[PDB]
């Protein structure tokens, strides 16, 4: 009786409001056709559907130099890598393309708009989404989008009304086109509370601690926290390594989820995969896996097989 009334109830909530309106936190996720891998299996896993969804607004947010921008450029890198077309609306004026190319972005064929207002930024994105040619669009950033009025001189609050209007319209078209939009935001105090509710995924990117290679300390350890997720149970979280100049370590992530899933064995500062030995201490095993793509792809597919 109690279950049937609950499963019935829950089923009607989905009928009238859609997919992830209600979920238990332990539930398995659905499994979409295609998603955009994040660049880290950990964050792919934490997201529950093995990557960022499509036809969705996505908010990545954190403080100055947290990594978010990198996380976003890997979404672009992967979207393109599968022959997708990308776009980048830029209000910050801080994109380093040399760094982008190192993560794997195809800057040469990356669409860039550097608009002159918030009105323009969004209307261009809106116009570009309806072409149905783009897979992903990034908008750096929500803070920098300053409304026409404010730029001309002519009471505040007009930015939040802008973000709200724009999203309502844009939210429709995204689900039709199968495009993904990423808004990068900083820390309606930073723009609009609207993004918070239109977003189907919201990631909280922070910097946990600085990595060090003994002397000459490279990279930072990042921690995304998936505070909202309509495509899968939320409040999951992932840590990974962003290395200066290289970005997210795909290999370093495979090791961590490796040992975690019991596929890899830490004997004693010694990393073992399935009889053979990978290296001595993470930075070796990582630098081994990067030299050997064959063993890297295998580990990835096995962890995925083992989950989704």
Curated annotation (Swiss-Prot):
It comes from the Bacteria. Its main location: cytoplasm. One of its GO terms (molecular function) is endonuclease activity. GO terms for cellular component: cytosol. Signal peptide: none annotated. The keyword Phosphoprotein does not apply. It is found in: Cytoplasm. This protein undergoes a protein self splicing that involves a post-translational excision of the intervening region (intein) followed by peptide ligation. SMART domains: AAA, HintC, HintN. Pfam families: Intein_splicing, LAGLIDADG_3, RecA, RecA_C. SUPFAM superfamilies: Hedgehog/intein (Hint) domain (SSF51294), Homing endonucleases (SSF55608), P-loop containing nucleoside triphosphate hydrolases (SSF52540), RecA protein, C-terminal domain (SSF54752). One of its GO terms (biological process) is intein-mediated protein splicing. InterPro entries: AAA+_ATPase, DNA_recomb/repair_RecA, DNA_recomb/repair_RecA_CS, Hint_dom_C, Hint_dom_N, Hint_dom_sf, Homing_endonucl, INTEIN. Gene3D superfamilies: Hedgehog/Intein (Hint) domain, Homing endonucleases, P-loop containing nucleotide triphosphate hydrolases, RecA protein, C-terminal domain. ATP binds at residues 62-69. Keywords: ATP-binding, Autocatalytic cleavage, Cytoplasm, DNA damage, DNA recombination, DNA repair, DNA-binding, Endonuclease, Hydrolase, Intron homing, Nuclease, Nucleotide-binding, Protein splicing, SOS response. Can catalyze the hydrolysis of ATP in the presence of single-stranded DNA, the ATP-dependent uptake of single-stranded DNA by duplex DNA, and the ATP-dependent hybridization of homologous single-stranded DNAs. It interacts with LexA causing its activation and leading to its autocatalytic cleavage. Belongs to the RecA family. NCBIfam families: intein_Cterm, intein_Nterm, PRK09519.1, tigrfam_recA. This is Protein RecA. The gene is recA.
């Amino acid at each position: 009786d109690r279950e049937k009334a609950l499963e019935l109830a829950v089923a009607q909530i989905e009928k009238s409001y859609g997919k992830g309106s209600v979920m238990r936190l332990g539930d398995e996720a659905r499994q979409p056709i295609s998603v955009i891998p994040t660049g880290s299996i950990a964050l792919d896993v934490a997201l529950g559907i093995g990557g960022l969804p499509r036809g969705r607004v996505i908010e990545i947010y954190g403080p100055e130099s947290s990594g978010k921008t990198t996380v976003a450029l890997h979404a672009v890198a992967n979207a393109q890598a599968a022959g997708g077309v990308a776009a980048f609306i830029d209000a910050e004026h801080a994109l380093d393309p040399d760094y982008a190319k190192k993560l794997g972005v195809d800057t040469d064929s990356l669409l860039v708009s550097q608009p002159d207002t918030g009105e323009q930024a969004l209307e261009i994105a809106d116009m570009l989404i309806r072409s149905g040619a783009l897979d992903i669009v990034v908008i750096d950033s929500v803070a920098a989008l300053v409304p026409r009025a404010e730029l001309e001189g002519e009471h505040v609050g007009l930015q939040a009304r802008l973000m709200s209007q724009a999203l309502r319209k844009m939210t429709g078209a995204l689900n039709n086109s199968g495009t993904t939009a990423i808004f990068i935001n900083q820390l309606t105090t930073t723009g609009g509370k609207a993004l918070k509710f239109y977003a189907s995924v919201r990631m909280d990117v922070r910097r946990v601690e600085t990595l060090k290679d003994g002397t000459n300390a490279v990279g930072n350890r990042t921690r995304v926290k998936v505070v909202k997720n309509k495509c899968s149970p939320p409040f999951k979280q992932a840590e990974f390594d962003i290395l200066y100049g290289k970005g997210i370590s795909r290999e370093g992530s495979l090791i961590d989820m490796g040992v975690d899933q019991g596929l890899i064995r830490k004997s004693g500062a010694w990393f073992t995969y399935e009889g053979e030995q990978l290296g001595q201490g993470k930075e070796n095993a990582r630098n081994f896996l990067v030299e050997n793509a064959d063993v890297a792809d295998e580990i990835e597919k096995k962890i995925k097989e083992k989950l989704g």
